[PDB]
Design a protein around this ligand. Structure first.
Ligand SMILES: Cn1cc(-c2ccnc(N)n2)c2ccccc21
Length: 330
C-alpha cells in the first residue's frame, strides 16, 4: 500500500510495524509542510474495528487529562475512516525498544539507560493505573523511543561496535487492549512471555498484571533475551517455578486449569526432554545477575517484587516509583 493516500493528505511512505490489528505506517502530511506522522491503519474486521474505537476513546481521555504527554503515552493527533479501515494518526516516534535491541545484535541496554527507561515506563503505566485503566499488553514492542538516534563506539570487552542512544526517552503505545476497571475483562491478555500467572491460571486480573509484564520487560532489557523461551502454558509455569520457586498453594487450589496440576503440584517431569530444556535455560532469578554491585542488586530486588506470584502481594507501580533503584535519577 506504499503510495496510497488517506483522507486526501497522508501519503504512505513506509511500514513501521505490523500486528494482529493491521499496520502502522509512516506518512507524509501534504497539508502540513511535508513533515512526517505515524498512522495506524486497522483491518476492516469487527474485533479490530471495536478495539480501535476503544483505543480512540482511551486516547481522547488521556490526551484531555495530559495534553503534553507528561506521562509519556503516545499522542493521537486525529482519527478518521478510509475504505472502512479506522485510521489513527500519531506523532512519529522512533524504533521500538525491541527493534533497537534487535538491530544492536541483542546486546542488552546499559544499566543507566535501563534505569531511565524503567522509570518512564512505570510513570506512564502508573498514570493509566491512576485512571482506572490496565494496559494488558505491555512488551518491548509497545515501548518506543522518542528519537532512536545513536552514537557508536568500539567496546573492547565484546570486541565489536555498539550503539548508544543519544536520548533514551520512551513512550508507551497500543491502547487497543486497554481495559477500564468497570468494563469486561478478557479471559486471556498479554503476549505470552509477558503474561502474569493469574492470567495463565484464569484467576481474574487487574492492574497488577501490568506490573508482572514490566518485570519481564526489565529482565529482557538487562539480559537481551527472555527468561521464558516458551510457547506452552504448562512449560511456562515450570519455567516460573525454576526461576521464582513454587507457585503458591492458594493459587493452585483456586484455578480450574487442572490439566496443569497433579495432586496440588505442577504436573511436571523434570527428567523429560522438556524438563531438561527448562533445567538448561532457566535458573533462580538472582543467578542471572551480571554483577553483584549494589545497583544491580536493587534492580533485581525490584524485579523480584514485580514478579511476585500473588497479584495482591505484588509491588504497585506507585510503590515502584519510590524504589531505591531509582535514586540516581534524582
Ligand atoms: C512503530 N509503531 C507502532 C506504533 C503503535 C503500535 C500499536 N499501537 C499504537 N498505538 N502504536 C506506533 C506508533 C507511533 C509510531 C510508531 C509506531
Amino acid at each position: 500500500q506504499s503510495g496510497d493516500v488517506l483522507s486526501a493528505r497522508y501519503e504512505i511512505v513506509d511500514t513501521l510495524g505490523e500486528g494482529a490489528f493491521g499496520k502502522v505506517v509512516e506518512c507524509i502530511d501534504h497539508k502540513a509542510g511535508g513533515r512526517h506522522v505515524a498512522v495506524k491503519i486497522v483491518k476492516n474486521v469487527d474485533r479490530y474495528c471495536e478495539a480501535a474505537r476503544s483505543e480512540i476513546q482511551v486516547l481522547e481521555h488521556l490526551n484531555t487529562t495530559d495534553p503534553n504527554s507528561t506521562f509519556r503515552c503516545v499522542q493521537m493527533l486525529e482519527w478518521f475512516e478510509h475504505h472502512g479501515h479506522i485510521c489513527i494518526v500519531f506523532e512519529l516516534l522512533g524504533l521500538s525498544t525491541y527493534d533497537f535491541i534487535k538491530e544492536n545484535g541483542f546486546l542488552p541496554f546499559r544499566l543507566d539507560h535501563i534505569r531511565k527507561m524503567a522509570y518512564q515506563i512505570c510513570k506512564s503505566v502508573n498514570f493509566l493505573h491512576s485512571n482506572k485503566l490496565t494496559h494488558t499488553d505491555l512488551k518491548p514492542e509497545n515501548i518506543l523511543f522518542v528519537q532512536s538516534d545513536y552514537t557508536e563506539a568500539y567496546n573492547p570487552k565484546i570486541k565489536r561496535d555498539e550503539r548508544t542512544l543519544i536520548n533514551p526517552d520512551i513512550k508507551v503505545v497500543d491502547f487497543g487492549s486497554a481495559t477500564y476497571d468497570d468494563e469486561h475483562h478478557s479471559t486471556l491478555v498479554s503476549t505470552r512471555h509477558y503474561r502474569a500467572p493469574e492470567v495463565i491460571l484464569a484467576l481474574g486480573w487487574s492492574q497488577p498484571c501490568d506490573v508482572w509484564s514490566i518485570g519481564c520487560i526489565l529482565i529482557e532489557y538487562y539480559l537481551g533475551f527472555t527468561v521464558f523461551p516458551t510457547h506452552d502454558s504448562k512449560e511456562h509455569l515450570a519455567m516460573m517455578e525454576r526461576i521464582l520457586g513454587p507457585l503458591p498453594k492458594h493459587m493452585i487450589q483456586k484455578t480450574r486449569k487442572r490439566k496443569y496440576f497433579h495432586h496440588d503440584r505442577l504436573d511436571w517431569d523434570e527428567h523429560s526432554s522438556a524438563g531438561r530444556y527448562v533445567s538448561r535455560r532457566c535458573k533462580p532469578l538472582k543467578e542471572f545477575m551480571l554483577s553483584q554491585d549494589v545497583e544491580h542488586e536493587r534492580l533485581f530486588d525490584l524485579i523480584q517484587k514485580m514478579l511476585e506470584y500473588d497479584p495482591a502481594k505484588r509491588i504497585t507501580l506507585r510503590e515502584a516509583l519510590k524504589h531505591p533503584f531509582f535514586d540516581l535519577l534524582k
